[PDB]
Design an enzyme around this catalytic site. Structure first.
Site, mmCIF file in Angstrom:
data_model
loop_
_atom_site.group_PDB
_atom_site.id
_atom_site.type_symbol
_atom_site.label_atom_id
_atom_site.label_comp_id
_atom_site.label_asym_id
_atom_site.label_seq_id
_atom_site.Cartn_x
_atom_site.Cartn_y
_atom_site.Cartn_z
ATOM 1 N N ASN A 79 -2.832 -0.375 19.215
ATOM 2 C CA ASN A 79 -2.845 -0.024 20.624
ATOM 3 C C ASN A 79 -3.475 1.327 20.859
ATOM 4 O O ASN A 79 -3.952 1.961 19.923
ATOM 5 C CB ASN A 79 -1.476 -0.175 21.309
ATOM 6 C CG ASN A 79 -0.506 0.896 20.958
ATOM 7 O OD1 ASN A 79 -0.419 1.300 19.808
ATOM 8 N ND2 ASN A 79 0.287 1.335 21.957
ATOM 9 N N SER A 125 -4.027 6.243 6.841
ATOM 10 C CA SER A 125 -4.296 5.758 5.492
ATOM 11 C C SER A 125 -5.790 5.720 5.391
ATOM 12 O O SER A 125 -6.473 6.300 6.220
ATOM 13 C CB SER A 125 -3.754 4.321 5.361
ATOM 14 O OG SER A 125 -4.490 3.420 6.239
ATOM 15 N N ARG A 149 0.865 -1.158 0.000
ATOM 16 C CA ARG A 149 0.000 0.000 0.000
ATOM 17 C C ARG A 149 0.922 1.234 0.000
ATOM 18 O O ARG A 149 1.919 1.212 0.700
ATOM 19 C CB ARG A 149 -0.858 -0.049 1.263
ATOM 20 C CG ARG A 149 -1.288 1.331 1.749
ATOM 21 C CD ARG A 149 -2.026 1.324 3.080
ATOM 22 N NE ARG A 149 -3.475 1.202 2.920
ATOM 23 C CZ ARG A 149 -4.282 0.803 3.894
ATOM 24 N NH1 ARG A 149 -3.795 0.489 5.090
ATOM 25 N NH2 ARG A 149 -5.578 0.701 3.670
ATOM 26 N N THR A 150 0.626 2.270 -0.800
ATOM 27 C CA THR A 150 1.440 3.511 -0.836
ATOM 28 C C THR A 150 0.809 4.548 0.108
ATOM 29 O O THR A 150 -0.393 4.849 0.004
ATOM 30 C CB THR A 150 1.475 4.149 -2.230
ATOM 31 O OG1 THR A 150 2.143 3.275 -3.128
ATOM 32 C CG2 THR A 150 2.247 5.462 -2.203
ATOM 33 N N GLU A 202 0.588 11.128 16.701
ATOM 34 C CA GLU A 202 0.027 12.301 17.316
ATOM 35 C C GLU A 202 0.506 12.561 18.740
ATOM 36 O O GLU A 202 0.861 11.651 19.484
ATOM 37 C CB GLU A 202 -1.514 12.192 17.330
ATOM 38 C CG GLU A 202 -2.181 11.961 15.953
ATOM 39 C CD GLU A 202 -1.786 10.617 15.354
ATOM 40 O OE1 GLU A 202 -1.678 9.637 16.129
ATOM 41 O OE2 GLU A 202 -1.580 10.520 14.122
#
Ligand SMILES: [Ca+2]
Lengths: 266, 266, 266
Positions: free
Chosen positions: C230, C207, C87-88, C188
């Protein structure tokens, strides 16, 4: 000089744009400018007399028709209104310079007042499709800015309270609302619409705030007017069909064009 | 190799940058680096004895003098402080690399301590123009990151509690706040300010978080110190005029520079 | 034609990708597509028989194997599932076109159903590491869009209620949540995580929402499933050790692969 070449001075292109307009229209200076957004294309027909139409692609920095309109005031003096042809959105990928070129070009023609209009989604159920709403302030959520340098502009009153009062002299029933600008072109999901409400918006759409910021920076006084295309995702229990949105939009035509004409005279 | 070219490894340019500094200054490694924001310009006059000055434009990757200062501590030991010459803001459009090059360069000289300062708008009425505020955490609203590729940096404690405690030794009264970074260069409208508050910010500005994220990635310990330029839009009913803000900024000068000087010795 | 060139039409590259796949695998059309995110690499081993593997770098537009799988249904009929290569991510810097190319390639093979999976941080303490969660809606915080023009697509029900019903026939205990996409790659800060909960998110990651928007524009029904890797920063008073996070994810492997296997047959 290509506007997208970083070395280009966008304001120099604005100047050339204005000059071109002065000689193609024969009007040395304009006093106000209007940006007709979605739902507002026929809204400038009752403004006054068309003095000139300039294919927009022929004006420096752009690339359908830009109009010079003579507005007759109550005391017999006249005003020249620059009506900008079309509008460039951020989602077209041309850079923020192309988005606010129309605004910088209007300020270079000497205009003092800018009337920004757009079509947008509302989060307030009392304002159904077809309802015009005055912008009291905005939240820009595109993470982009039209200014490129150490810029000292105060944005405490982007939308002139002076002009909002005038608009209310014309139609005392118009409500006011905060508008949030999303990059677009896709629309907001119901969770993004709740998000905007939590952040303080009453309206969502895809333009205007970067133009308002560029206007203020050039010293223009700004009047923002939204037309609620319809309620944003998840706001209405029974959402309008596309045919319904279009018809409600159409039926607002006369009201909306009478409002700009009356306001243009003051 | 141009920092610009996507093929270029930013860290190798920072390596060259440190080597140039060591050679131009005669100081093999630095112990702390300071980035002086808006209003902090002369806040490094009391730091210690300037050992060297290096025209910033002559250091690899940059494009203003960078200074190497000898800080003298209590127990006679000395430390070398790297005071970076300029600062590149995100709004200049030179890319996020040019924005964090000074931080990556400081890391390469081996300075493990980074002091980041800025000027910002406050949302707390108890902190008027001229108040220095410690960053306890931040909110990056630029939708940008200085990290390229699968670099999963933990930002759980970006601003070192250890450093805040030392700052409190020099002035136990310093407040602490969460800083929000907007792309700039324009300031926020009253509605954007209210949004920032709802999101949990106490301060709003236009730099620092990208720099702080790159510092962590390099394993640096970060102290963030914000200077409230003034209350943000719509926070005060009684806004100070531009002349007053400037004046208030000048008057904090002395306090502010005594603070960094003391903090620098620990 | 490089997807990279603005001139190239992304959908034409998707067509080529799809014709290439149909040829290399011998499967004229696929019925469904799956994208396996972090923590899902082994969850397609119980789907059915692998009819073909195509090195991904060999398919038009990409740049590590794509698989065509046969799904045997209860009534003896079959389906072909396209299991996309890696996946990009947006943080890789190759542009939004590169991020949603797999989704548009899938649509081009005829797939009508898309299953997007990812590994994310959770903000609900009731969902510990290892918990799979169905996506009810999302909040795109990257300030980007995969759509390139006046593409006026409705996102009122991005994540198909039909598909969430079916997922619920397989495991009625799966919870649903709102997912927030951040550009990343940095995680974050605790202030940013609090921010996401105030905005209405239950999960944060890097994503998915862009892929989901591109899928709906192409008319695919979408099922999103997150695996909480998590708890996000500051949610857990007691932070899991690396060992724990890893073990929780491995413990989930059987449950997850059985889920997709059952869903794939409806
Ligand atoms: Ca050291």
């Amino acid at each position: 000089p290509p506007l997208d070449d970083p070395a280009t001075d966008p304001f120099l292109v604005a100047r050339a744009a204005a000059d071109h307009i002065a000689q193609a229209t024969g009007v040395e200076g304009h006093d106000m400018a209007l940006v007709l957004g979605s739902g507002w294309g026929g809204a400038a027909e009752l403004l006054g007399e068309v003095v000139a139409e300039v294919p927009t692609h022929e004006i420096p920095g752009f690339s359908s028709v830009t109009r010079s309109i003579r507005v007759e005031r109550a005391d017999g003096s006249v005003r020249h209104a620059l009506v900008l042809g079309s509008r460039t959105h951020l989602y077209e990928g041309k850079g923020v310079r192309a988005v606010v070129h129309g605004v910088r070009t209007a300020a270079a023609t000497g205009a003092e007042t800018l009337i920004l209009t757009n079509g947008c989604g509302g989060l307030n159920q009392e304002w159904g499709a077809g309802t015009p709403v005055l912008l009291s302030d905005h939240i820009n959520l595109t993470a982009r800015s039209p200014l490129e340098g150490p810029t000292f502009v105060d944005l405490t009153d982007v939308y002139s309270p002076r002009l909002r009062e005038l608009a209310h002299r014309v139609d005392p029933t118009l409500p006011e609302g905060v508008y949030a600008q999303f990059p677009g072109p896709h629309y907001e999901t119901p969770a993004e619409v709740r998000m905007a409400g939590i952040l303080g918006a009453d309206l969502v759409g895809m333009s205007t705030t970067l133009e308002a910021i560029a206007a203020r920076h050039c010293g223009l006084e700004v009047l923002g007017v939204s037309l609620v295309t319809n309620l944003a995702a998840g706001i209405s229990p029974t959402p309008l069909s596309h045919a319904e949105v279009i018809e409600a939009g159409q039926a607002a035509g006369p009201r909306i064009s009478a409002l700009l004409a009356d306001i243009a005279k003051r």
